[PDB]
Subunit: 228 residues, 3 copies
Amino acid sequence: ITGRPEWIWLALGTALMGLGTLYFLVKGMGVSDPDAKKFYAITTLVPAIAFTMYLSMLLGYGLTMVPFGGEQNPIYWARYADWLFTTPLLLLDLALLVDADQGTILALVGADGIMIGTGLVGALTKVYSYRFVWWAISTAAMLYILYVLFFGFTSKAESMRPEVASTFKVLRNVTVVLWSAYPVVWLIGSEGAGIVPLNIETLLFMVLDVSAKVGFGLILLRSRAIFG
Amino acid sequence: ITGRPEWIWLALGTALMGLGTLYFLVKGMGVSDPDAKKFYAITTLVPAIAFTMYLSMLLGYGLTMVPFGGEQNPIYWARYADWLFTTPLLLLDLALLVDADQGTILALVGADGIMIGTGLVGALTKVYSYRFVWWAISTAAMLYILYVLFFGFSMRPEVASTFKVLRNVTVVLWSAYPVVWLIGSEGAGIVPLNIETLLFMVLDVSAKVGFGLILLRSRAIFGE
Amino acid sequence: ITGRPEWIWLALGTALMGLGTLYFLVKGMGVSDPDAKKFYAITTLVPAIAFTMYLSMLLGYGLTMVPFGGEQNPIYWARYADWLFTTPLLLLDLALLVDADQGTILALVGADGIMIGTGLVGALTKVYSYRFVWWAISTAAMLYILYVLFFGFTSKAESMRPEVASTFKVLRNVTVVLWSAYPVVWLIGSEGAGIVPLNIETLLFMVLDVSAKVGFGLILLRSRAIFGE
């Protein structure tokens, strides 16, 4: 397990997601309000799933080798299995906060599925050039998501009660800033250009993941915005 | 890319699904009615997902080789990844149009999953004879879905007329899929892969973009 | 098809899930109550999905080989593809009976996904010791589910009409008993310690599966509890 330099970040990630899950689990005990139960369920599931995928990477299961650019490249595919479930859950937290229309929720979840799915195909693609075609489609989907979060129902948040509008705006900002970093890290890291070593890329995703999951959840579950 | 003769149909499919997606995206802008939003979201996602899977097939990612009949057979598995998501969305469009009960929506989506899932298992199965067992199970699931669309469902006249048209389009186009599979490279191998690819492309664009044009052009999508 | 000794149990499972599916399909015909329609849809899909996965195992498609402990180990991965969909559906039946809040349903479905997903990872893991780490995580998720069924639903079912309360308690007990057996069979079977041969393990899972699906469904769909109003 300790052979590759990035093991320490995978271990740390596993530990932080695990601790985060247990905290949210305990914190959610006794909560009887139906709306709050939804938020605790969603928000506890996110780092619980991430925990399993961090462990998969730590133990070697979530790592494969993909040929491109004339070499065999180490790819952690477990990330996508994590994000496939956790990113729409995070979007669901936001959508519930502002009471979004079901059509808008479906649009977000589907666009997010496309984003992660094309990211995965890009990550596993054996023809170097095509990798970035997938990256571009995935980024278009992300920009669509960010557009909806800002110009999609941001008006609905404003016309909610102050505690909701306020918590939403904070979490929206966190989301846009943190999520926007992912395509950059992918682009300069091992999946893409190979400018940053895998060790550092893994550290970067770990810091992003923990912030976007546990950080995000702390802010959300600490707020009275979750109560109906 | 140009190495496989079917590339031209995969390229055309990619372009038409993409163009269709962009059109539905723009057309859906500034739509505020909750029900209409639902239909636009569903109907826009359909060719968006199909666009990605056509591109996957065009670029070679969504192609594999399955041994059966003593040979190595080219199988585009990407189709099932597409249909797994897009066919239930299309059924959802129809179900919402008639305000179907949740139990019925679950039955349709579930049967559809079984249809595509067994289709995929058949497509990847290495014993030639068994491939057709899976085809028969999948076809039974399709027949169940068709039965429900005709017998398993009192609505305003715009809704009733758009539904009937979309249902008939669906029943006719979907029924062609099992035939194309049976005679094509996945089944008997009577029709060569480049022609089969052309056939699925015409069917897919009609069942997705054509279907969507009829639906999103109708007043049926707006909630009284 | 008869080349592996467990074939007979896979054939029997296929037939029992198939028959159960056809019986539930026919029984559900003409049911117009919206609530009952949900229960029939859920409950019929369960054995229908199980039927396809039993057939996949029977035909050899849902079998792979995984090296660990100095052997090539036969692993039926099709079980996880089955359980991934059928276990959440079974949980859904229970949740609807007691009119569970959405948040509780999502918690159950999410925990169930983790249970099956980590079970699958454990099943395919080539480092022998790590297989049991996954098993333990999966078992933790199962225990969480069982906790919810007892300290979330049993409380919400008691405050319901008597037919419902009664049918739920039976189905809850059937579920807790049967589901608890799965991690044990896995642990001592081919996926784990290898104390019980594969043919016997397949018999065990078949009896459990048929009871947990068709048995469960027979108890549920016979009850008046599936009707609303």
